[PDB]
Design a protein around this ligand. Structure first.
Ligand SMILES: CNC(=O)c1cccc([C@@H]2C[C@@H](O)N3c4cc(C)c(C)cc4N(C[C@H](O)[C@H](O)[C@H](O)COP(=O)(O)OP(=O)(O)OC[C@H]4O[C@@H](n5cnc6c(N)ncnc65)[C@H](O)[C@@H]4O)C4=NC(=O)NC(=O)[C@@]423)c1
Ligand SMILES: [K+]
Lengths: 133, 666
């Protein structure tokens, strides 16, 4: 009902190698040459990708900035307020980014802020004006 | 198997049902009640047992019924019927037995038997033991036919058959207690050796053998599961099917390599896209840093847009600094999966040129067993006889297998150096015309009621005919003769003055440098007491090595043997015999094989007697007069000695049924 295990033998396979007196050798060459084809395409991209690895020497280490380990406060200095209105102008509704700029406020009171100070800081025309970008 | 049941097995009979032959002789029993069928079967099996437990004496009907017990020894006609059926068809009292009853003073009917090979001999002994006048016509100066044995001094080696294929169900077992044959078992250990001269290591040997066996089952799958049995309006051969299997294994090796490196590209390119991202992102981080440095260069206190510019660039830069870290976490994985994949590459080849040369030896062994190149064997049928294989070890004959035919010939009218040239068969009887092989001058005429032809199939095949049939044989018989295969297989007997080989291995191989020469001197045998090695020529090599002189051939043998054992341990052989069976005009080959486009049905066609037309038009249909036997006429055991012998046993039953009447069918 089934071939010996390891042996490969399908009805489609046998016809293709039996079509003529050279079909077998012809088919075995379409694959010798499909194998070369892929094999030096390999050493191509392997060698493109070795160029890109040099251009990344040193990584991004002269370029990192230390960590602002800053305890999260709750009151709103007028300074912290004006930073906020500008982040809304620059980041729309990305509350994580806005909480990262102001630094000492967590993402919830950013949401809280959007409401309590909504009339007074005119946050709707700001967001409108950010969507235009 | 043991008991009366083992008697049936040892006679190639099922113990628990009746055969087609018995249905024909005992149609009353078979259509009868299930209980009657069963009584018969015990009577048969018990009589077989009595014969088998002592085959050096005749087993008389009287002696049979004494040793039966009731209820079985109650019906005496059934016992007499069963005994006479067994006696007639060579299941008991065949071979070389002592006659309790001396045989009738005057005989009945005359039979001429062409050939005194084993099939001829075995018929002749049966016919003569049935009360017939028998004469055998033999072209050679010796009995045996293709059982040839070389003898010079204490040197003994078979040029013909040399193996008994196992005593389980084998009639040669009976003949073994009857004639003293020193039967010695064959150790199946066969160490291969390449053309370099050095042994193949166990690791390789087990690989290739199992690939060989696997390649064989592959062809069977092709044959019985994909109906790949005709290609280009021609029947497929075994060799054809083996190439197609091998090519498909070679193809699938290449298919696997392509799908492997196709995974390496599918990841090298996922890496390419990944590093183009870490360039274009490191260049944004290189720019933002500049912008943040400048914005932190504006000295405080700052107004709030300029403070937002610092804080904002700082957020934006740590954010791109985080994308770049997740992209080098992911980069790291991709650099590993590429030492994963390129450290586990699939198989480089299917078989190296070395491995194909050892595979070619296992193909020579197969070409040896079937005495023909695999390109000629029918894929469907080449193994149609494997189901009737005998159980047990294979054996050799240490005193030489000629001792069997020589023993059968005891007491028989044999004309040697008598070559039949024409067989004439008509409604009233037959005349055989033979010449003398020495002076073809002296001509002979033999008149008889029946001819039993055991001419080798290669002789029947010969064109122009070596033997003329008058009238000619019908198409249905000549076409079987054309379709069947007659193969070829030769031996070199090497006679030395000292053992220089391993005396504990019966047989060892030599691997050919090329496919075309795979059968050329590929195997050696140490079967005998004396220092004799024996060397096989199989496959396409067999036919070609017959145009090469003895000395050239014995040369290549010593070379190969020097390579194995070192150039100083091999003496020049004292005596050297090379067989040429395709040249032997009383053979034209070694034995038959199931040719592509043939089938086992041809072997039954070879067996059907010929019946001549009526002499007087409108006269009643006559009796058959021309009968055939020999190895090419027995479907389930072709190409062997036991098969010839059985074919002679059956024609004797058939001829006697015809000319003495079969009283046991009432
Ligand atoms: C698929 N096969 C397996 O499965 C198998 C299985 C196990 C073992 C074997 C082996 C192989 C080999 O290793 N050995 C062997 C070797 C050789 C070289 C040869 C040549 C044969 C064998 N035989 C076969 C065995 O040899 C033969 O099949 C029988 O001998 C048949 O004999 P028969 O049919 O009677 O015909 P003859 O030819 O004998 O007689 C006819 C007479 O006609 C005379 N004659 C001609 N012309 C005229 C004329 N014009 N006028 C008057 N007379 C004329 C002629 O002179 C002759 O006398 C093997 N079988 C084994 O069992 N053991 C072996 O060991 C094996 C293979
Ligand atoms: K072996």
């Amino acid at each position: 009902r089934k071939p010996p295990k390891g042996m490969f033998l399908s009805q489609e396979d046998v016809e293709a190698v039996s079509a003529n007196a050279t079909a077998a050798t012809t088919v075995l060459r379409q694959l010798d040459m499909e194998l070369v084809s892929v094999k030096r395409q390999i050493q191509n991209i392997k060698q493109t990708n070795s160029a890109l690895k040099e251009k990344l020497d040193g990584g991004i280490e002269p370029y990192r900035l230390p960590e602002v380990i800053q305890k999260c406060n709750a009151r709103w200095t007028t300074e912290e307020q004006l930073l906020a209105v500008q982040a809304i102008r620059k980041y729309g509704r990305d509350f994580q980014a806005i909480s990262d700029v102001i630094g000492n406020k967590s993402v919830v009171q950013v949401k809280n802020f959007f409401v309590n100070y909504r009339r007074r800081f005119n946050i709707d025309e700001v967001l409108q004006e950010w969507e235009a970008e | 198997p043991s008991g009366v049941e083992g008697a049936a097995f040892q006679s190639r009979l099922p113990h628990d049902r009746m055969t087609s032959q018995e249905a024909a002789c005992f149609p009353d029993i078979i259509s009868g009640p299930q209980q009657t069928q069963k009584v018969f079967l015990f009577i048969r099996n018990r009589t077989l047992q009595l014969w088998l437990d002592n085959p050096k004496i005749q087993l008389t009907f009287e002696a049979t019924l004494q040793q039966l017990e009731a209820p079985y020894n109650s019906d005496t006609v059934l016992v007499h019927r069963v005994h006479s059926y067994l006696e007639r068809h060579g299941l008991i009292n065949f071979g070389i037995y002592k006659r309790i009853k001396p045989l009738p003073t005057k005989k009945t009917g005359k039979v001429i038997i062409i050939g005194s090979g084993v099939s001829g001999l075995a018929a002749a002994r049966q016919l003569q033991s049935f009360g017939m006048d028998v004469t055998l016509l033999e072209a050679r100066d010796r009995v045996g036919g293709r059982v040839a044995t070389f003898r010079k001094g204490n040197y003994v080696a078979d040029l013909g058959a040399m193996v008994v294929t196992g005593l389980g169900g084998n009639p040669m077992a009976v003949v073994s207690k009857q004639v003293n044959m020193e039967l010695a078992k064959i150790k199946q250990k066969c160490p291969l050796y390449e053309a370099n001269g050095q042994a193949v290591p166990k690791e390789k040997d087990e690989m290739v053998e199992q690939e060989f066996n696997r390649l064989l089952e592959a062809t069977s799958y092709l044959s019985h599961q994909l109906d790949f049995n005709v290609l280009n309006n021609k029947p497929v051969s075994l060799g054809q099917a083996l190439e197609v299997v091998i090519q498909l294994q070679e193809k699938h090796v290449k298919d696997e390599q392509i799908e492997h490196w196709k995974k390496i590209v599918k990841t090298q390119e996922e890496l390419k896209e990944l590093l183009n991202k870490m360039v274009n992102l490191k260049e944004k981080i290189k720019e933002l840093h500049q912008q943040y440095k400048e914005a932190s260069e504006v000295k405080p206190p700052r107004d709030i847009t300029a403070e937002f510019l610092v804080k904002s660039k700082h957020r934006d830069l740590t954010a791109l600094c985080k994308e770049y870290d997740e992209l080098a976490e992911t980069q790291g994985k991709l650099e590993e999966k590429l030492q994963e994949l390129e450290a586990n590459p699939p198989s480089d080849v299917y078989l190296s040129s070395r491995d194909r040369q050892i595979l070619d030896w296992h193909f020579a062994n197969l070409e040896f067993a079937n005495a023909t190149p695999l390109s000629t064997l029918s894929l469907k049928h080449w193994d149609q006889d494997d189901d009737f294989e005998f159980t047990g070890s294979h054996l050799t004959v240490r005193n030489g297998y000629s001792c069997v035919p020589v023993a059968l010939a005891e007491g028989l009218d044999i004309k040697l150096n008598t070559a039949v040239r024409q067989v004439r068969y008509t409604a009233s009887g037959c005349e055989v015309i033979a010449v003398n092989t020495r002076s073809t001058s002296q001509t002979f005429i033999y008149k008889c009621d029946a001819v039993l032809c055991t001419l080798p199939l290669g002789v029947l095949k010969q064109q122009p005919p070596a033997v003329q049939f008058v009238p000619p044989l019908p198409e249905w018989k000549t076409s079987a003769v054309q379709r069947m295969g007659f193969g070829n297989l030769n031996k070199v007997v090497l006679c030395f003055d000292r053992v220089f080989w391993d005396p504990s291995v019966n047989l060892f191989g030599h691997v050919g440098s090329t496919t075309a020469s795979r059968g050329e001197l590929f195997l050696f045998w140490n079967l005998y007491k004396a220092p004799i090695l024996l060397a096989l020529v199989a496959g396409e090599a067999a036919g070609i090595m017959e145009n090469i002189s003895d000395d050239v051939i014995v040369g290549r043998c010593l070379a190969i043997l020097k390579g194995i054992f070192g150039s100083s341990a091999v003496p020049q052989p004292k005596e050297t015999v090379v067989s040429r069976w395709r040249a032997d005009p009383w053979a034209r080959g070694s034995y038959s094989y199931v040719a592509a486009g043939s089938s086992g049905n041809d072997y039954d066609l070879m067996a059907q007697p010929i019946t001549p037309g009526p002499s007087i038009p409108g006269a009643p249909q006559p009796i058959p007069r021309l009968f055939f036997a020999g190895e090419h006429t027995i479907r389930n055991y072709p190409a062997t000695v036991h098969g010839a012998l059985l074919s002679g046993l059956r024609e004797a039953g058939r001829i006697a049924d015809q000319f003495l009447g079969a009283m046991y069918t009432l």
